[PDB]
Write an enzyme that holds these catalytic residues in place. Structure first.
Site, PDB file in Angstrom:
ATOM      1  N   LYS A   2       0.770  -1.319   0.108  1.00 30.60           N
ATOM      2  CA  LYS A   2       0.201  -0.046   0.069  1.00 30.60           C
ATOM      3  C   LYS A   2       0.786   1.267   0.001  1.00 30.60           C
ATOM      4  O   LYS A   2       0.716   2.237  -0.639  1.00 30.60           O
ATOM      5  CB  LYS A   2      -0.973  -0.052   1.161  1.00 30.60           C
ATOM      6  CG  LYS A   2      -2.094   1.172   1.124  1.00 30.60           C
ATOM      7  CD  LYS A   2      -2.887   1.190   2.343  1.00 30.60           C
ATOM      8  CE  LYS A   2      -3.894   2.098   2.117  1.00 30.60           C
ATOM      9  NZ  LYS A   2      -4.628   1.997   0.603  1.00 30.60           N
ATOM     10  N   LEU A  26       3.317   1.918  -1.547  1.00 29.14           N
ATOM     11  CA  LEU A  26       3.747   2.214  -3.002  1.00 29.14           C
ATOM     12  C   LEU A  26       2.620   3.060  -3.904  1.00 29.14           C
ATOM     13  O   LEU A  26       1.299   2.874  -3.656  1.00 29.14           O
ATOM     14  CB  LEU A  26       3.907   0.928  -3.675  1.00 29.14           C
ATOM     15  CG  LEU A  26       4.893   0.088  -3.273  1.00 29.14           C
ATOM     16  CD1 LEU A  26       5.188  -1.323  -4.288  1.00 29.14           C
ATOM     17  CD2 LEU A  26       6.389   0.339  -2.917  1.00 29.14           C
ATOM     18  N   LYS A  64      -6.446  -7.429  -2.088  1.00 31.99           N
ATOM     19  CA  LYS A  64      -6.455  -8.715  -2.770  1.00 31.99           C
ATOM     20  C   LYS A  64      -5.045  -9.193  -2.567  1.00 31.99           C
ATOM     21  O   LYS A  64      -5.135 -10.456  -2.692  1.00 31.99           O
ATOM     22  CB  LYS A  64      -6.478  -8.256  -4.332  1.00 31.99           C
ATOM     23  CG  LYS A  64      -7.918  -7.646  -4.634  1.00 31.99           C
ATOM     24  CD  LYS A  64      -7.935  -7.411  -6.166  1.00 31.99           C
ATOM     25  CE  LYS A  64      -9.401  -7.346  -6.541  1.00 31.99           C
ATOM     26  NZ  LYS A  64     -10.135  -6.110  -6.154  1.00 31.99           N
ATOM     27  N   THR A 115     -10.407 -10.315 -27.709  1.00 32.75           N
ATOM     28  CA  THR A 115      -9.623  -9.165 -28.108  1.00 32.75           C
ATOM     29  C   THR A 115      -8.212  -9.137 -28.395  1.00 32.75           C
ATOM     30  O   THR A 115      -7.684  -8.102 -28.631  1.00 32.75           O
ATOM     31  CB  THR A 115      -9.756  -8.142 -26.666  1.00 32.75           C
ATOM     32  OG1 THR A 115      -9.169  -8.950 -25.616  1.00 32.75           O
ATOM     33  CG2 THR A 115     -11.294  -7.992 -26.282  1.00 32.75           C
ATOM     34  N   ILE A 120     -10.325  -6.225 -33.164  1.00 31.02           N
ATOM     35  CA  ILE A 120     -11.391  -6.752 -32.349  1.00 31.02           C
ATOM     36  C   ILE A 120     -11.187  -6.174 -30.817  1.00 31.02           C
ATOM     37  O   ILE A 120      -9.986  -6.450 -30.005  1.00 31.02           O
ATOM     38  CB  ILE A 120     -11.677  -8.316 -32.167  1.00 31.02           C
ATOM     39  CG1 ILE A 120     -11.819  -8.841 -33.467  1.00 31.02           C
ATOM     40  CG2 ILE A 120     -12.855  -8.451 -30.988  1.00 31.02           C
ATOM     41  CD1 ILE A 120     -12.221 -10.277 -33.502  1.00 31.02           C
ATOM     42  N   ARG A 179       7.408 -11.679 -30.858  1.00 29.80           N
ATOM     43  CA  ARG A 179       8.253 -10.474 -30.672  1.00 29.80           C
ATOM     44  C   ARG A 179       9.318 -10.364 -31.871  1.00 29.80           C
ATOM     45  O   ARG A 179       9.454 -11.522 -32.792  1.00 29.80           O
ATOM     46  CB  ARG A 179       9.215 -10.735 -29.377  1.00 29.80           C
ATOM     47  CG  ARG A 179       8.348 -10.614 -28.065  1.00 29.80           C
ATOM     48  CD  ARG A 179       7.985  -9.322 -27.583  1.00 29.80           C
ATOM     49  NE  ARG A 179       9.331  -8.426 -27.841  1.00 29.80           N
ATOM     50  CZ  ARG A 179       9.017  -7.061 -27.222  1.00 29.80           C
ATOM     51  NH1 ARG A 179       7.993  -6.375 -26.956  1.00 29.80           N
ATOM     52  NH2 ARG A 179      10.027  -6.228 -27.134  1.00 29.80           N
ATOM     53  N   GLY A 220       8.104  -5.108 -30.427  1.00 25.69           N
ATOM     54  CA  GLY A 220       6.812  -5.481 -30.596  1.00 25.69           C
ATOM     55  C   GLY A 220       6.358  -5.233 -32.239  1.00 25.69           C
ATOM     56  O   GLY A 220       5.395  -5.978 -32.835  1.00 25.69           O
ATOM     57  N   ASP A 245       7.787   1.013 -36.220  1.00 24.55           N
ATOM     58  CA  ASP A 245       7.359   2.643 -36.019  1.00 24.55           C
ATOM     59  C   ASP A 245       8.213   3.351 -36.916  1.00 24.55           C
ATOM     60  O   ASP A 245       9.177   3.835 -36.479  1.00 24.55           O
ATOM     61  CB  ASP A 245       7.048   3.073 -34.710  1.00 24.55           C
ATOM     62  CG  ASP A 245       5.761   3.905 -34.850  1.00 24.55           C
ATOM     63  OD1 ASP A 245       5.660   4.969 -35.511  1.00 24.55           O
ATOM     64  OD2 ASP A 245       5.027   4.095 -33.729  1.00 24.55           O
ATOM     65  N   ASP A 295       4.061   0.617 -38.906  1.00 28.23           N
ATOM     66  CA  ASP A 295       3.145   1.802 -38.973  1.00 28.23           C
ATOM     67  C   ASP A 295       4.138   2.950 -39.816  1.00 28.23           C
ATOM     68  O   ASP A 295       5.533   2.585 -39.481  1.00 28.23           O
ATOM     69  CB  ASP A 295       2.951   2.598 -37.662  1.00 28.23           C
ATOM     70  CG  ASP A 295       1.597   1.706 -37.036  1.00 28.23           C
ATOM     71  OD1 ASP A 295       1.062   0.605 -37.642  1.00 28.23           O
ATOM     72  OD2 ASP A 295       1.342   1.716 -35.821  1.00 28.23           O
TER      73      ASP A 295
HETATM   74 MG   LIG Z   1       4.802   2.011 -31.196  1.00 27.08          MG
HETATM   75 NA    NA Z   2      -7.831  -6.433 -30.156  1.00 31.09          NA
HETATM   76 NA    NA Z   3      -0.338   3.797  -2.489  1.00 36.86          NA
END
Ligand SMILES: [Mg+2]
Ligand code: NA
Ligand code: NA
Ligand SMILES: [Mg+2]
Length: 331
Positions: free
Chosen positions: A56, A58, A68, A97, A102, A145, A185, A188, A252
DNA sequence: CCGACTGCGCATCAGC
DNA sequence: GCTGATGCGCC
DNA sequence: GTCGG
């Protein structure tokens, strides 16, 4: 360096799963970033957390997450997550997703209609848009990758073809690749030309010609989207005789006005933390930095005309600072 | 208690 | 036919 | 979900 997954990997993974569920199923993007933030700060914690109260302290971890962590540390799992993983609807939505194109909304409709797997998608291609189909077609490829050596070969092809179209173009491959990353990933690419400035011609041909050349030499294989300014698509390194085919990659390409080029380079080079921290620092010195320009504030907050930029160094200097080498822009 | 949490290009939808 | 909204991917 | 006005 960075603390090993061994330290608090169970906690960080738990937070990342909940992060994905919030964005993909609950459609609560802010709770998604809240969780990721919590996961990051814990992934940096160089100590094995003994309690939720310890965590906590942090920045990014509040009461809910503290609770949790306590449940996880005491039992080894989280009931709410354990229940989400078994839910057919939440899992399916979450899964779909992972297909580029999507998002939370489309994933929801597909599941509401029974479409829950990649196989279901293939049998229903007519229900997918162009982007989604490319995402499907390259599902696996898009999750792999990109090792630096391949990015280097990819850069070779890009710089070679752009220069071939018009030797006056200026191209810069940004992203983690520019920050010296061992893997990436995607690719660009930032583009500019002397004939393209904020107050000049918009020219739809500048980006179009380059994309065309890369398609002519078979480097670009697919198009997700393409306007007069931004291009998103797919590329693939040519195959060596006898050797296996290369995975298709996300690329891209952005056409930026020459006077906003270096602010663009800096921005798309990252890191996001480096950008946030550099924006935060830029604030102290009385400056505001974004993807497009750098502007001077006038105490009340009146940002005047964008200051002239001709290199990344110019930006660093403006804010009373030394140019940081891309390889160090981690934080 | 309660708003911010970046904001934009491009594709595609919803409505006039 | 158009304009504006929405979904999506992204520092 | 967390932080901060
Ligand atoms: Mg990028
Ligand atoms: Na997606
Ligand atoms: Na905190
Ligand atoms: Mg919701």
């Amino acid at each position: 360096k960075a603390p090993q997954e061994t330290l608090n990997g169970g906690i960080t993974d738990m937070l990342t799963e909940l992060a994905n569920f919030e964005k993909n199923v609950s459609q609560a993007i802010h709770k998604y970033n809240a969780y990721r933030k919590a996961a990051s700060v814990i992934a940096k914690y160089p100590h094995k957390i003994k309690s939720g109260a310890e965590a906590k302290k942090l920045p990014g971890v509040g009461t809910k997450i503290a609770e949790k962590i306590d449940e996880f540390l005491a039992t080894g799992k989280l009931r709410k997550l354990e229940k989400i993983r078994q839910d057919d609807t939440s899992s399916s939505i979450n899964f779909l997703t992972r297909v580029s194109g999507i998002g939370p909304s489309a994933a929801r409709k597909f599941v509401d209609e029974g479409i829950k797997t990649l196989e279901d998608l293939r049998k229903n291609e007519d229900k997918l848009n162009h982007h989604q189909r490319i995402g499907l077609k390259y599902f696996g490829d898009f999750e792999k990758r990109i090792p630096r050596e391949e990015m280097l070969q990819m850069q070779d092809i890009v710089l070679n073809e752009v220069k071939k179209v018009d030797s006056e173009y200026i191209a810069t491959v940004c992203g983690s690749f520019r920050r010296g990353a061992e893997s990436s990933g995607d690719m660009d690419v930032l583009l500019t030309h002397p004939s393209f400035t904020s107050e000049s011609t918009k020219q739809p041909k500048l980006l179009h010609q380059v994309v065309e050349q890369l398609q002519k030499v078979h480097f670009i294989t697919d198009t997700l989207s393409k306007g007069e300014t931004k291009f998103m698509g797919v590329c693939q390194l040519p195959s060596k005789n006898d050797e296996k085919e290369y995975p298709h990659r996300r690329i891209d390409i952005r056409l930026i006005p020459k006077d906003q080029y270096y602010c663009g380079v800096l921005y798309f080079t990252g890191s996001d933390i480096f950008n946030k921290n550099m924006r935060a620092h830029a604030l102290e010195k009385g400056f505001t930095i974004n993807e497009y320009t750098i502007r001077p504030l006038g105490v009340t907050g009146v940002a005047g005309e964008p200051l002239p930029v001709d290199s990344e160094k110019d930006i660093f200097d403006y804010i009373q600072w030394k140019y940081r080498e891309p390889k160090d822009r981690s934080e």
